[model samples]
Target: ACPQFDDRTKAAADRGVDVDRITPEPVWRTTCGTLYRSDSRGPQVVFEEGFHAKDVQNGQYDVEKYVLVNQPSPYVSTSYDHDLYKTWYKSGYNYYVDAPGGIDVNKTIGDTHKWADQVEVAFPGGIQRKYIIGVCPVDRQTKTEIMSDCESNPHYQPWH
Candidate 1:
């Protein structure tokens, strides 16, 4: 079950948002192509200076479900991070996620070696957020496919 936190909900209300319609502030994607939102994080602050923040704030993201070339890794855990998710979408990969007339997942994740997979930094360089571990990559390049090491061996874990 998805955990619900009040901080984001409260923040939304304070921001003049219709809280009912904007329940979860941080959206997450599971390795096997599941997109869900939870309020584990607080409401996202609008950064007017960002290149694509305005468009994202306007809900203009091409929100698409995660698609796996191989089967899902049962050992991997599902998690979501606000900064990472937004960066991935805003940095121009949103349209690459299997949208209609869009490029496939292999080209999207495989190209960068999941470079956008980490959280956007304020920044302590070379650090990977613990919560992001085991989250499936968009393709098989990261050894997390259904029968791969990360999935097949319960003891196996990913570095980032």
Candidate 2:
């Protein structure tokens, strides 16, 4: 004859399993700095250093634009024999893969993600202060090749 257990059942007479020993711990915080969604729609420009809100209104800074990464790739294949290589090198304004010490735009597989603040800008008369945000993939192989080339070049100044 099995003993019947109900809400009124006593502990010693009950056949139910008892649970014990639960502890609470504090949660540790992890930080992953601020991240922004890459806007691949169009090019965006950032001004150079010293340009401020007053300067924009005063006509001190003229051009304010930047490149956006909206397309599937940066290079235009028709421009060069190697489509992939052309795309990589032609994307940025000041930086290009083929440039000295620049990334090899040809061998890059994914989009380079980057963010930069506006630093400064060059106006017709002089330089203004500003900054910009940019995102692009790092071309690993091209970087390696450029580094190797630099090492072999005796007059190459790595800093520049």
Candidate 3:
């Protein structure tokens, strides 16, 4: 009824529901301006940086690699060998979670998910790029796919 109150507030009032009484969904904004909204599956990507691509020649890229949201939660866990393409440095799992300011993709509940390596590699013809794709094997009607919208933070480092 007033300019200060938007249609959502007015509608809630009409329905006899106090807007303040309703738990607002938590929104996460990445430092790079990406947005995520928390839901039943946990925080989901709502706004993307529009850098989704298949080739490394494109800038940097990452996508959810292994995800299984089965009814029984599945035996869900992920590990990374921590290699930089040709560089034989390796590690996994905990490195991602321990990184400061990194997106805690493992912190979510309700589904089995894991982030793949967003890697940078050099190919023939001097083409150097970074990218990751979302693809996984299926056993039943589980939810498995790459979330192209959510990207892995590149700042984290594992043992060399």
Candidate 4:
């Protein structure tokens, strides 16, 4: 996500965001090489005219290649026994029937919220930025259908 688009180098140049200004002199060559190939592995040894042997030795940067595998699980089970069995067992008969005062029906939700809040504070940008990268799977057709349904709904963009 750092180098977003294919023409990022050209865009950076056009915006006057100099690669040399951002990175070390030796590391600049590696950054330049990223513009050409997004999936290049091994040492940052560019065959360009301006490349130096000493720089090449010191300018080694790790080029990690990521594949986005959107494979769905073969036995994807979304329905759980929570409607009548697990719900009553977890929440209890009194809590399920009537909301009791000072009774925590869903303590796990509160705990999860607290954990999420702590993570959000720790990583101000977002937890996904720090933890999530590369490939992750999703049901493409299901996601598209869900998006279409949401877009048609009046409560679409509910957060807004």
lDDT of each: 0.21, 0.19, 0.20, 0.16
What's the C-alpha lDDT at position 60 in model 3?
22
Clashing pairs in 3: 56-129
Q: Write the per-residue lDDT of candidate 4 for residues 1-160, one digit (tens) a residue.
A: 1332233232110122223322111111111111111111111221111111122122221111001121221100111111222222222111001000111112212324322221110100101111111211122333211222211111111110
lDDT of 1 by residue, 1-160 (tens): 3333333321111132222332122242223222211112211211111111111133312212222221221111112232233423222111101000111223334424443343211100111122122222222233222224221112222321
Best first by TM-score, ranked: 1, 3, 2, 4
Model 4 local distance difference test score: 0.16
TM-score per prediction, in order, is: 0.19, 0.15, 0.16, 0.14
Return whichever of 1 and 2 wins on TM-score.
1
> How much is 21 displaced in model 2, in angstroms?
75
- Residues 1-160, candidate 3, lDDT per residue (tens digit)? 1122232322110122222321122111122211111111211121112111122232221222222221211011222222221121221111112110112233322124332232211111110011112111221222322234334534322321
TM accuracy, model 3: 0.16
Clashing pairs in 1: none
TM-score of 1: 0.19
* Better structure of 3 and 4 per TM-score: 3
User: How many clashing residue pairs, candidate 3?
Assistant: 1
